[PDB]
Amino acid sequence: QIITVSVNDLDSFGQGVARHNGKTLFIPGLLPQENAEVTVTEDKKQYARAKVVRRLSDSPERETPRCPHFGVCGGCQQQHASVDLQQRSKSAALARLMKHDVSEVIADVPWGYRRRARLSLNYLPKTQQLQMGFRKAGSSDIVDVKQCPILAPQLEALLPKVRACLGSLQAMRHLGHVELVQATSGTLMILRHTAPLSSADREKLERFSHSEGLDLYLAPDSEILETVSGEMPWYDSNGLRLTFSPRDFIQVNAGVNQKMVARALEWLDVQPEDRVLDLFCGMGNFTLPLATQAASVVGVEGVPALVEKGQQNARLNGLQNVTFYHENLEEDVTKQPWAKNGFDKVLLDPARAGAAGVMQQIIKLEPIRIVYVSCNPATLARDSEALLKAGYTIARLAMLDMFPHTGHLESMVLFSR
Ligand code: SF4
Ligand SMILES: [Cl-]
Ligand code: NI
Ligand code: NI
Incomplete structure (x- = not known):
């Protein structure tokens, strides 16, 4: 009951990470290098949790939360951390996972987004x-x-x-x-x-x-x-x-989404003769802008309603060089007739689980560049390993600040030969 601690780190999820008597402590509301009197109501094996009773000092990165519901609403975790700190802490985690420096942070408005x-x-x-x-x-x-x-x-x-x-x-x-x-x-x-x-x-x-x-x-x-x-x-x-x-x-964050798409296009360095594949393509977030640059584009998506909207939006925008296919991306699709002309460039934006069975499929296709957008750096890191083993290198890595003040950690990586 009641002890004194110092926070070492700010985790992805916005709780301060400290140690006491050699055990990891997770304390909500406390920032790197702040000190506090705290109490644990929750003591376990590999870690413990605690609440601040009296914070003894302030980080220079500490901000005043803008929302009166912060601390109670599940929607935000880190309004008390400046935007620089949020970005620095997420970028550091990503760099450590990928064993590679973060090349850039893609961000927009921290409020009203x-x-x-x-x-x-x-x-x-x-x-x-x-x-x-x-x-x-x-x-x-x-x-x-x-x-x-x-x-x-x-x-x-x-x-x-x-x-x-x-x-x-x-x-x-x-x-x-x-x-x-x-x-x-x-x-x-x-x-x-x-x-x-x-x-x-x-x-x-x-x-x-x-x-x-x-x-x-x-x-x-x-x-x-x-x-x-x-x-x-x-x-x-x-x-x-x-x-x-x-x-x-x-997409929730319109500004960051538009910047992500623009950047992914710059990274893929799409040429007028390129054939491009867009996996997990939804209704064509990346796919349709890719078709404005490439000879031809294929999108592959698992919801038919999204495939049909992609087709409609292609027609509405005068994009005649794009085809959308409904496929189950859990099965082998290098078999398919649309694979055989081959691909120069590949973009994928899967969900949390990643694209594990898909990495070998992309490798078989031998694109010269691949852009992978991820919401789960752990799976990104595992999938990267397969591409690295097959001769690709990390050319660029970005942290995408898509949900400011939350624990999300989105990222994007360019692999090339
Ligand atoms: S989501 Fe964030 S800004 Fe909105 S009410 Fe919850 S804490 Fe406030
Ligand atoms: Cl509904
Ligand atoms: Ni609803
Ligand atoms: Ni490098």
Whole structure:
């Protein structure tokens, strides 16, 4: 009960890392080189946890959190760390894993950067209140969100007005969640609800969205999406106009995404005669901009709805030299007819698990350059080993600061011969 410690390190996840009596201590709210009186409620084998009771000193990289919900909301972990410190700590971890220096950090605005949010809704029958916000750290309980400085300003401004509108509904107790999305075309609101809405409630929602200039969609279940108002949304990115369905996945950080795509294109050094392969291509985030430079592009993706949107967006942007295939990237696809003309360049952006079975497949293809975008540096590091064994070197490595103030650690690597 009560001991004095010094924090050595700031981990990926935003807790300070210290040692006491030779055991690792994880302390939330404490930064590298700060000292503190602390208490452990949680003592285990390989490590222990503790809370700050009194912080004795301050790092020069310490900032004042901009959000009043920070420390309680599960959404942010590191608002107390300056952006330089966040970037330095993540870059250091990445460099250590890859055994290679970080060439650059790709970043944009540290605040106001999220172009979509899903707000959970929960009804409290004992007090007849509606909660609207995000999950708490290590709990399913909702923090009522009144401000969210990471959210795009158009969306942040809507928070109290959405709250008062939903709080006015008869159907308040039967609401699931509400998604707010900002796109070049307009602002979108999607309300997921659990039973039929009355006409008085539909009218409130209609008048509200109509007053605020929002496109409104209602989702009575997991498949149905009714357009109350709006035309097909779209956003502009990297020289293209890209339509999307309000359910479909679009990137959270628009600015960092556009910079990532632009950089990946510079790294691939795409030539007019190049044939390019884009694995895990989604609806063509990288694929469509690659087609503006290359002789031809193939995208491969496992969701058919994304393959069809990629095709639609190619046509809309006058891209005749790109083909999208639906494939299962867990199986062997060097077999396929689209492989045989071969590839000069390959880009892949998989999920957390990585592309393990895929690395040998890429190697068989013998591209002169490969760009790999990862959200899990551990799997990136394992997959890199296979490319290094087959004669590729690390030409460039970047830390992508896609989710400021969180524990995410995204990265991008250029391999070449
Ligand atoms: S900025 Fe938003 S996500 Fe981050 S702690 Fe505040 S409410 Fe949660
Ligand atoms: Cl939905
Ligand atoms: Ni939803
Ligand atoms: Ni090097």
